[PDB]
A paper describes a structure:
We reconstituted the biosynthesis of the benzoxazole moiety found in nataxazole by adding two enzymes (NatL2, NatAM), to 3‐HAA, ATP, and Mg2+. We have determined the structures of both NatL2 (homologue of BomJ) and NatAM (homologue of BomN) from the antitumor nataxazole pathway. We show NatL2 catalyzes ester not, as previously reported, amide formation; the amide is a shunt product. NatAM catalyzes benzoxazole from this ester by a mechanism that we propose involves shuttling of protons to control the fate of a hemiorthoamide intermediate.
NatL2 consists of two subunits in one asymmetric unit that PISA46 indicates form a homodimer. The individual monomers of NatL2 are structurally equivalent and can be superimposed with a root mean square deviation (rmsd) of 0.348 Å over 420 Cα atoms. NatL2 has an N‐terminal domain (1–320), a C‐terminal domain (326–404), and a C‐terminal extension (405–436). The N‐terminal domain, which binds AMP, forms an αβαβα structure with an additional β‐hairpin.
Residue numbers in the entry:
A (entry chain B): 0 to 322, 327 to 436
B (entry chain A): 5 to 436
Amino acid sequence: AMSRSRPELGDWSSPAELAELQRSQLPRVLAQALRSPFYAARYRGTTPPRTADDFAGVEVTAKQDLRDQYPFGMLAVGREHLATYHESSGTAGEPTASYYTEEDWTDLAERFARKWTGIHPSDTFLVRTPYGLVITGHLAQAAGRLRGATVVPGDARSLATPLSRMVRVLKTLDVTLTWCNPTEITMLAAAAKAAGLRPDQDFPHLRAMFTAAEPLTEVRRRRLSEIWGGIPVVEEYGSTETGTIAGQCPEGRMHLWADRAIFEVYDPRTGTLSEAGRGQMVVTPLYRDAMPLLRYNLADDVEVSTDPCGCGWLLPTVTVLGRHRIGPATVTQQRLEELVFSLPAAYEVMFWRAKAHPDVLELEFEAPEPVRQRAVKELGAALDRELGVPHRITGLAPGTLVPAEALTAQRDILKARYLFAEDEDWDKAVMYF
Amino acid sequence: RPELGDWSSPAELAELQRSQLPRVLAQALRSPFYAARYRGTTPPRTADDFAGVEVTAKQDLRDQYPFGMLAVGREHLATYHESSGTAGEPTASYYTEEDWTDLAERFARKWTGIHPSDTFLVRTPYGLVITGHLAQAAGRLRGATVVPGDARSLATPLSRMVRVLKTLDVTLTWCNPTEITMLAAAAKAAGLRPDQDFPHLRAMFTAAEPLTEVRRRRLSEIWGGIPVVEEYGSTETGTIAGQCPEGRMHLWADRAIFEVYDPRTGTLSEAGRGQMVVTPLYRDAMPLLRYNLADDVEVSTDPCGCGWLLPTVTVLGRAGTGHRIGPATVTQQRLEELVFSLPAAYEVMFWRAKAHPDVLELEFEAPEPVRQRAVKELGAALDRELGVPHRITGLAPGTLVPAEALTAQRDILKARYLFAEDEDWDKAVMYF
Ligand SMILES: Nc1ncnc2c1ncn2[C@@H]1O[C@H](COP(=O)(O)O)[C@@H](O)[C@H]1O
Ligand SMILES: Nc1ncnc2c1ncn2[C@@H]1O[C@H](COP(=O)(O)O)[C@@H](O)[C@H]1O
Ligand SMILES: [Mg+2]
Ligand SMILES: [Mg+2]
Ligand SMILES: [Mg+2]
Ligand SMILES: [Mg+2]
Ligand SMILES: [Zn+2]
Ligand SMILES: [Zn+2]
């Protein structure tokens, strides 16, 4: 406890103390950055930044820089010192590489593990995010290991672990915590109902759901909580190349982990960087060796506030607005989402999609037949009142956007076989997935 | 825990094993399964009493789902797993941190070594099964850079694994032997020669299916003559045998008592032909007493040229069961040796066969100029070596393994709800 190497909540009593925790790490950080081919080349000829003061002059690092430096242009240590290598989600054609030492991994795990509900050895923790190149599954599992929780590696987007099998695991293993994106929370609820289980009653050991990766309105988050019996839905904000940079407090806001990174809001028009306001999320992580980043622009649209929260945490808050005009009206996924998830929970509307045409908003959603026409009418009124856009809203039969087989299919985990008996299906010979 | 070199004879090995049995028998009796099994009676407590210990069947692990085999409080578990095979009847297994050190050490017994300078591509599943987690933990134990490929995942198609193999200078892979050929076919589709264009690739680790020496040597040749290092394991046991430099798998008998079960007689011997029985010696969470993995195996105590003081094991599994086809008996093992005895220039890697009562139906891919020579030579080989009537069909590449499997690229999408007029909104809630 005495010789803990990185700060934790409670180590500062003021914003000036926080700023000194940050400033004191900058000489080590600037020295480590200069070991990478990217920064050594950037500061070739000139004198590199070495002091906290020099940081004010440090040029933004763009997503496009990380892509151009693929794979190891940002690497500051020998490859012998790397523990894991990762690529970000998004375009497969233009990969974003990131990589971490064991010591880098302790910082990552500690940041994920800042869940206000706690992670305890008595928890059974279902990790239902991908383990394929992306960090998300590995990050949750490492936080689970750090805190002693029993980790169930569900993975996501894998033929080994369909939703039917995840519902069975949730129920029969008395799972206490989940990690999955907010769409997966509704997919698991629909799979539960398909198996004849009520998400709001039949999972009494489930005490919290951890989520990230999508823009999530308070309206949808509250509905996800309600679907699963009113348990906490605990949001964090991160990326493969940064780790977790903000986490929810008990009052439902995400706070920036400023003890572990310098956070700045970038106005691309102005080219200026401030500590707060509206603009693009810029990050300087303070406790990484392998892949130093100096003012990395995640290029997410964010609002950062230094206004105190009811939680009492001495950290700024962040709303993530995401990274369409129909006549004058701007329509965001966020605004439509608040209207869709304001429908009464009894209508069981979870799955929807919209297309922004120049002239009209096309919107489709699944609802059971009895409530479909009520739902279409109420959502139409809500769009008229709140957005005033012309719309074509179509109610769909369940199983049309999210097929019954996604919710109920069971899939044997087969190995390759080459010789078959007459009565066997040899179409699973070499293609056994 | 012992390492190779800690015993100088089979009697010393047996004493390393016997000395752990009191702790193991005591830990087993903490589980509801063994407590119930030995209810009323006095339980086995000594090395000598082990000779009387009843086999534990696969069906027992299934019946005890989920935590009937659990010997510690759930607070002490690190990870929970389910085995490959039938989804309808899950086999649960689970491990403490200390259980995980034994698992990682056993996997890390690769005669080629795992070193911090290695870049290690883990191309097996992380979904409930242990295999991806096991390789990653061994990688971490030894300081190798782990690239988590995963397998059976939409995030990591073959095209992307081939790109990573090449551009990251990958030195080691972990994937089943069919995935070794799938990566070779995907390599060619990306314009890369498996036998020349991956000069940093120094070894390929493999397991999970019956593998003849003939096929293993061909996999090595496809990838430029580098070592193909086989292990034998299961989700519920971990790695129980690993390859030596002479190309045989040795049982990790310092970490588990191995016995061959004859199902008709119900007897257990140290060696011979029968079903693989395992008593792991260094696990707390899920003690197993003579667990019958029910794989068909031959164990030999004949000394190996490698000088390792451990018995060797061939694993037949399902690949050893004879199908009767007219006069002859055919195993997958024997067919495999004939298919992979075709000249390497024919590029025959993907095949399948059906045992009919009257005839062996066999299909395989071979590129166009050589396809008919391949069909003729494989026909002659079957006549000379098996004498089965056969119908052999040579297929164009892309028939058994479609070109799309080898070349498809898939963006890793999040859910999107709002789309622009010109976008495909059939990626909305089904974004996988
Ligand atoms: N809580 C969140 N709210 C909104 N967007 C998020 C959130 N968490 C992550 N994201 C988005 O997901 C990106 C990270 O993608 P990846 O590198 O694949 O994890 C971020 O840069 C954001 O665009
Ligand atoms: N080297 C190997 N040779 C043959 N079969 C193997 C080998 N390794 C694993 N297996 C098979 O895979 C099973 C374990 O499956 P899983 O629990 O999914 O790892 C074993 O019981 C065998 O049937
Ligand atoms: Mg390394
Ligand atoms: Mg990203
Ligand atoms: Mg635990
Ligand atoms: Mg198994
Ligand atoms: Zn707060
Ligand atoms: Zn040997």
